Amino acid sequence: ETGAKVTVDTVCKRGFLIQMSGHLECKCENDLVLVNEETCEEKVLKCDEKTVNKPCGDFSKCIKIDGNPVSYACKCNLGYDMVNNVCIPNECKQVTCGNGKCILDTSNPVKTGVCSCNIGKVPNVQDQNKCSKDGETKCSLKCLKEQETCKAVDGIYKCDCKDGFIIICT
Amino acid sequence: DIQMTQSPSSLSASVGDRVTITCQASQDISNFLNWYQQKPGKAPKLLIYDASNLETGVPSRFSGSGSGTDFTFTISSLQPEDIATYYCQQYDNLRIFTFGPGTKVDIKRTVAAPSVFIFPPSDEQLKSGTASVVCLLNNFYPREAKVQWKVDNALQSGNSQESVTEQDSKDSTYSLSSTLTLSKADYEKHKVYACEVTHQGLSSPVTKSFNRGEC
Amino acid sequence: QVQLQESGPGLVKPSETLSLTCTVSGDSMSSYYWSWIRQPAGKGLEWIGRISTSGSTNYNPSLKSRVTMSVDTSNNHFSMRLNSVTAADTAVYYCACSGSYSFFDYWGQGTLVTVSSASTKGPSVFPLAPSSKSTSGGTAALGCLVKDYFPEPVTVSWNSGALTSGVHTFPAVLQSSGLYSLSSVVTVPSSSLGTQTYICNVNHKPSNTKVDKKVEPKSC
């Protein structure tokens, strides 16, 4: 995390908690975008004078660029940089994790990127701490909604329908 | 329907007047309220967005204020080209766009007499058995006007229709077109065709006429 | 920045599906939220629904069960379909867009949709000839009579748009025949009547009728 550590008690506004091998984070409902680590909002689709400072993506806003004539661009929030057209923590610029993603280490006072892996993998000290070693992760999510439990979906833990339910879970 | 209000529903003001329009959203929408100007026969044009931001290129005499539920729109000095219906538009937490009922602003101006013109039916139309005679009242104020058709000095009734343009965006006047419709047979039976115009700007009624076959 | 242009069928029969298309020129369509908004004659504006090229849809709950929308970026088309139309669906339909999700800063010109069982009928165009009974103090008036068409609208330009000052195109009147009739006039200096040619360009899109009519002055 770049801010406070996300926990099982964190409320994701217009979002929901997900778990990987080394952290929790908020994922947005439908097509919303993160304006911070705990808040999702609608995004604008074009950056100009009318949409300045509006969210244009995960951890990005339309920012006034002080160029030859003034222009506007979707620019990552403080602490983030564009890598493959998505905003990731600056200290993750050069970090490659494979079956996972880079996060800031909330246990380190020096800002440092570490790999947090898909459910199934763990940091491999033999392989530059990338997500190449197979390993188990205990799910921390409570999943108190109707007929819901922590399930692994596409490499991440999320609360989902129990055995025999689809769409609230019926 | 979700209920929004705009006040007044219409108004008539002089050029140079300060015009203030109010809008009340259906709920607290913070600053998600926009103002549009719809000139007659045209698409709405965004003037104010996010309650108080002036659209690029919009004259500085337009402004908006407010937050939450109660909003105002102000034209600091009404200009002739500003005649239009103005709509506020909210965006709520269900992502629904709702337009207010709208405020029509008209312009008061000095009385202006109509220019009166009469048009005989064309030879092309006469080939088809129908004769349309048209009387034009050009650039007058106020909107109220009386047109009477006389055929050989006999007052006509039931065989005419008229329509009026919206207020002109330059001189704030109106125009009116009245069509007298007869059969070709009836048209050929009479000589003088006249429309007689009564209007506030005329001291006495004005008649424009022609003789069938004068040309 | 984009330019929007609606196109529609003019007439649509009741209970059938209304199909509209908005042709876009300019910026990439992916930079905008695309919406349809309709307005019955003399009434307010009703937003129908909003979509993006990402596949997101945001239809008005009052019309969600009847309306669908789509974008074809290959042909720069933004379309909507409205099922089971009735007389309540007769209105001017606008396409509109914005980079913002909460307002509309780009609009088309609107296309009038008339729900009706009747067939389209193209208009007859007759000249309104300027004469001495059509002259004031140096000002002459001339025009064109656009008669017996259905449905609305017709558009009238003068000299292919070169003549705009003093033009008055009046609201159509409903005749007892059930067909519309409209006149368009323009005032000019009387000294120009013999030196300039005046042509009204009448377009009735629902019937694909384009008529150019030269308006000749009278000697009397």
Side-chain angles (χ1 to χ4, degrees), chain A residues 1-67 69-132 134-135 137 139-150 152-164 166-170, chain B, chain C residues 1-108 110-132 134-213 215-220:
Chain A
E1 289 89 312
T2 57
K5 194 171 174 181
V6 179
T7 71
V8 300
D9 297 323
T10 293
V11 170
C12 303
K13 196 172 176 180
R14 298 190 167 82
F16 54 92
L17 289 168
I18 62 155
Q19 183 170 357
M20 302 183 61
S21 76
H23 79 292
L24 299 173
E25 64 181 58
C26 291
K27 191 163 200 202
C28 291
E29 299 288 359
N30 49 78
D31 60 356
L32 305 183
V33 303
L34 296 159
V35 312
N36 59 45
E37 294 182 320
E38 291 80 22
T39 316
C40 296
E41 296 182 7
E42 287 191 274
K43 67 169 175 175
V44 304
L45 295 177
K46 183 177 176 60
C47 290
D48 55 18
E49 180 175 26
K50 290 169 254 183
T51 57
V52 61
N53 301 313
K54 288 293 198 140
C56 51
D58 290 330
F59 303 110
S60 55
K61 308 184 202 113
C62 297
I63 300 297
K64 173 174 148 176
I65 310 300
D66 298 310
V70 171
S71 64
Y72 301 89
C74 189
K75 191 182 208 184
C76 296
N77 297 352
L78 292 164
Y80 298 77
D81 261 29
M82 292 282 285
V83 179
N84 304 317
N85 300 338
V86 296
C87 294
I88 73 172
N90 296 325
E91 299 73 11
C92 287
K93 268 186 294 190
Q94 298 299 318
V95 180
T96 70
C97 296
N99 299 320
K101 61 180 291 183
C102 175
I103 61 172
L104 288 194
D105 185 4
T106 60
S107 75
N108 191 343
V110 180
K111 295 180 183 187
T112 312
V114 302
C115 291
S116 184
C117 302
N118 296 336
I119 299 305
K121 317 284 181 186
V122 288
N124 189 350
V125 73
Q126 312 287 322
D127 187 39
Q128 293 154 77
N129 294 262
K130 301 177 178 185
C131 297
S132 59
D134 279 6
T137 288
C139 182
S140 311
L141 301 185
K142 311 288 185 184
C143 304
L144 304 185
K145 289 182 179 298
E146 164 75 358
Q147 283 288 74
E148 284 194 14
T149 192
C150 180
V153 177
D154 275 357
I156 55 94
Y157 275 149
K158 54 184 291 183
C159 297
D160 217 356
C161 296
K162 267 173 186 170
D163 285 314
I166 335 178
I167 314 298
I168 205 172
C169 296
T170 180
Chain B
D1 80 302
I2 123 183
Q3 51 187 50
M4 301 171 71
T5 70
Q6 282 186 236
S7 306
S9 57
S10 62
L11 66 95
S12 191
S14 293
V15 168
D17 281 5
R18 185 180 182 86
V19 177
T20 299
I21 300 170
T22 61
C23 172
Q24 187 165 42
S26 67
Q27 75 189 23
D28 193 324
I29 57 169
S30 67
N31 65 347
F32 291 104
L33 186 105
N34 318 291
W35 289 92
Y36 300 81
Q37 168 194 69
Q38 185 174 34
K39 288 177 199 185
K42 308 269 161 207
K45 173 180 180 190
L46 177 71
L47 297 190
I48 304 283
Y49 65 95
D50 294 336
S52 58
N53 300 111
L54 198 62
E55 168 75 308
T56 298
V58 172
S60 69
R61 64 172 176 280
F62 297 98
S63 67
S65 67
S67 198
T69 58
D70 294 329
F71 301 83
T72 75
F73 175 86
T74 299
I75 313 173
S76 67
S77 172
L78 192 67
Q79 295 308 119
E81 64 268 24
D82 296 343
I83 53 182
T85 301
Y86 293 82
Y87 297 94
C88 57
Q89 172 259 308
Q90 70 176 46
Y91 183 79
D92 65 13
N93 63 322
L94 296 187
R95 318 173 190 202
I96 298 174
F97 304 76
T98 306
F99 290 86
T103 295
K104 190 182 177 101
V105 338
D106 303 306
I107 277 175
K108 296 175 316 168
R109 60 148 295 155
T110 55
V111 60
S115 286
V116 185
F117 309 92
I118 189 171
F119 299 98
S122 66
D123 289 327
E124 186 187 355
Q125 185 186 26
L126 289 185
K127 293 179 210 149
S128 75
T130 300
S132 304
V133 198
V134 176
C135 182
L136 169 63
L137 287 56
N138 207 39
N139 290 64
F140 59 87
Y141 187 92
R143 187 183 188 276
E144 293 73 37
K146 182 189 194 86
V147 175
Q148 288 183 306
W149 284 97
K150 290 178 186 177
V151 176
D152 280 340
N153 211 34
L155 176 64
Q156 302 299 285
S157 79
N159 51 2
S160 60
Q161 293 180 275
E162 64 182 36
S163 73
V164 184
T165 56
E166 216 83 35
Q167 193 166 27
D168 187 80
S169 66
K170 289 191 202 79
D171 64 359
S172 306
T173 62
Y174 300 87
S175 297
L176 185 154
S177 172
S178 173
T179 302
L180 176 75
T181 299
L182 322 172
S183 68
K184 180 195 177 187
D186 289 349
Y187 177 72
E188 299 295 343
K189 292 179 193 158
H190 305 101
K191 185 184 174 186
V192 185
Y193 291 84
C195 59
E196 181 179 312
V197 174
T198 303
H199 186 265
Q200 189 86 92
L202 307 169
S203 41
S204 48
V206 164
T207 295
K208 281 294 189 301
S209 67
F210 67 87
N211 305 321
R212 170 186 55 83
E214 183 72 33
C215 262
Chain C
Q1 309 81 338
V2 287
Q3 301 85 44
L4 276 41
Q5 179 55 60
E6 298 88 347
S7 61
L11 286 173
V12 56
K13 292 182 190 303
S15 74
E16 302 192 354
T17 294
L18 164 66
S19 177
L20 298 168
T21 306
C22 181
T23 300
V24 181
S25 47
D27 262 4
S28 276
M29 294 187 70
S30 62
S31 294
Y32 302 88
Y33 288 99
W34 297 95
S35 282
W36 287 94
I37 296 128
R38 63 180 187 175
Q39 184 173 36
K43 292 284 179 282
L45 295 147
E46 183 185 19
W47 166 76
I48 301 175
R50 182 194 72 196
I51 63 173
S52 80
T53 60
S54 83
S56 81
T57 70
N58 175 28
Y59 301 144
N60 190 325
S62 66
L63 298 167
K64 182 167 184 45
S65 67
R66 304 169 56 204
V67 75
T68 58
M69 296 176 186
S70 59
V71 292
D72 185 3
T73 55
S74 292
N75 301 286
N76 284 119
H77 287 163
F78 165 53
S79 306
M80 66 162 273
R81 288 175 42 102
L82 183 67
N83 293 323
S84 306
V85 299
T86 70
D89 297 309
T90 292
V92 172
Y93 286 74
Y94 296 99
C95 57
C97 69
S98 183
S100 162
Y101 55 79
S102 67
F103 53 80
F104 316 104
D105 48 341
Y106 299 95
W107 293 70
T111 178
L112 177 64
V113 174
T114 301
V115 181
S116 166
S117 62
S119 309
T120 321
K121 191 184 168 310
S124 294
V125 181
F126 303 114
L128 296 171
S131 71
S132 61
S134 151
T135 52
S136 201
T139 287
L142 61 104
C144 283
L145 176 64
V146 182
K147 187 144 161 54
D148 297 337
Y149 61 93
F150 183 83
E152 292 192 286
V154 298
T155 60
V156 182
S157 66
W158 285 92
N159 295 345
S160 300
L163 180 55
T164 56
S165 197
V167 177
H168 288 308
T169 298
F170 292 86
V173 295
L174 182 61
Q175 304 170 109
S176 63
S177 62
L179 305 178
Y180 293 102
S181 178
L182 165 154
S183 62
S184 178
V185 302
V186 60
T187 50
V188 301
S190 53
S191 42
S192 62
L193 282 184
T195 194
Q196 197 55 248
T197 59
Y198 293 109
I199 303 164
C200 68
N201 320 107
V202 181
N203 192 14
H204 184 238
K205 294 186 179 187
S207 68
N208 294 101
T209 300
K210 290 202 178 75
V211 172
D212 304 313
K213 198 72 191 190
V215 180
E216 307 287 359
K218 302 294 260 302
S219 43
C220 46

